[PDB]
């Protein structure tokens, strides 16, 4: 309830700021002023053309490493279990495999960007 009111207040304040910024000043837009910005001249191609991604392999690994966070965040609560020896074995197992996966991608030159 209060978080909804807070979010609404923040979004409304930002929107009113945009509205003020767009309706208070004197607008004079003509074709040359709104043209795309290159440093001095006109662009050759488009900004919508494909832009090659040299770290594409690290990005996919980020998805798999991100989900290893969902497995480790309940660890503060798991420390309150009675049988700590099986919990600590499983928590360390979950991090050794995460370390071994990082080591594997490192040694196979997976962490290097495409040249």
């Amino acid at each position: 309830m209060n978080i909804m009111l807070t979010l609404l207040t923040n979004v409304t304040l930002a929107s009113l700021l945009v509205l003020i910024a767009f309706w208070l000043p004197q607008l004079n837009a003509y074709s040359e002023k709104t043209s795309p910005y290159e440093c001095g001249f006109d662009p050759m191609g488009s900004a919508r053309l494909p832009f090659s991604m040299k770290f594409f392999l690290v990005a996919i690994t980020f998805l798999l490493f991100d989900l290893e966070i969902a497995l480790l965040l309940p660890l503060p609560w798991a420390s309150q279990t009675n049988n700590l020896k099986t919990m600590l074995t499983m928590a360390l197992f979950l991090l050794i495999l995460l370390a071994a996966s990082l080591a594997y991608e490192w040694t196979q030159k997976g962490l290097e960007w495409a040249e």
Partner: protein, 318 residues
């Protein structure tokens, strides 16, 4: 009465951002053998007000090739998330008392990147697109290390509630328990707020204005306000997490003053770091985060899992 609390949280943060602009300019000036603004008002006090009034009286620009909906949405999302990131911070009583506060900060911080992404894409310009892809790379660099550092630190807290961090540090700061994690967390917060030596997305020398190259006037101002508010909020979070002030239940003013002093110290440390160092290459930042920070983070996560068990020092509040 709760709306009064929201306003009394929102307006002072905006004023503090406005005067952090002045404080950064003056600190960088004096660190560079000059003065910084002193002419407008006594000691440059009125400079932020002049800048704010000048920007919101200047014509806004909509690019011909830009897609207007995302172009307008991006600054609104940036500023609204920057203001929202403040509600669970206990100073010493949070505005919104969350059972999972740190998770909320992580989620809103992750969502705040799409402001830069969508602004850079909707600008429909090459420099803005380059800045947006640099933002993608930066997030990929810092996110996992930041989350694991947070987990390792909070393992001594017993929960994700931010108000419990004060009880954790009744007697000692957690910087004396996890100073390596504190160092890596400080670097991660530098990289997360796009601050020097990691101000890659703006890329001023490299990419002109970068992602917000197209933006002008009020919309540009909103992006700037969001950036500064994020700086202050992250330093406040760092102060709560690692430098625990003493809270007297019959006098919260002492906690508030001590907290504010520590937050100011950390923000001035950011300004100092900006004034002292050159800029990374954004591929070098990724290698720093994945080849140096990540192995230590995993090793120290294992260490901070094992320590309370073998020490018989497990925190309460399952």
């Amino acid at each position: 009465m709760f709306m009064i609390n929201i306003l009394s949280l929102i307006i002072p943060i905006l004023l503090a951002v406005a005067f952090l602009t002045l404080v950064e300019r003056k600190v960088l000036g004096y660190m560079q053998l000059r003065k910084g603004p002193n002419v407008v008002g006594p000691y440059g006090l009125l400079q932020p007000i002049a800048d704010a009034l000048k920007l919101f009286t200047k014509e806004p620009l909509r690019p011909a090739t830009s897609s207007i909906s995302m172009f307008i949405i991006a600054p609104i999302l940036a500023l609204s998330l920057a203001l929202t990131m403040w509600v669970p911070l206990p100073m010493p009583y949070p505005l919104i008392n969350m059972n999972l506060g740190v998770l909320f900060m992580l989620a809103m911080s992750s969502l705040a990147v799409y402001s830069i992404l969508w602004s850079g894409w909707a600008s429909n310009s090459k420099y803005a697109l380059i800045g947006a892809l640099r933002a993608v790379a930066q997030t990929i660099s810092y996110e996992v290390t930041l989350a694991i550092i947070l987990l390792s630190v909070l393992l001594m807290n017993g929960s994700y509630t931010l108000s419990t961090l004060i009880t954790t540090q009744e007697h000692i700061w957690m910087i004396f328990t996890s100073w390596p994690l504190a160092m890596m967390w400080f670097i991660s917060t530098l990289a997360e707020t796009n601050r020097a030596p990691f101000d890659l997305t703006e890329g001023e020398s490299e990419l002109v204005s970068g992602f917000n190259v197209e933006y002008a006037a009020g919309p540009f101002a909103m992006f700037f306000m969001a950036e500064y508010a994020n700086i202050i909020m992250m330093n406040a979070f760092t102060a709560i997490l690692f430098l625990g002030a003493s809270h007297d239940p019959h006098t919260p003013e002492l906690y508030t003053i001590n907290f504010v002093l520590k937050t100011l110290a950390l923000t001035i440390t950011f300004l100092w770091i900006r004034a002292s160092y050159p800029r990374f290459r954004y591929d070098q930042l990724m290698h720093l985060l994945w080849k140096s920070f990540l192995p230590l983070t995993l090793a120290l996560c294992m260490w901070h899992i094992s320590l309370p068990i073998m020490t018989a020092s497990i925190p309460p509040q399952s």
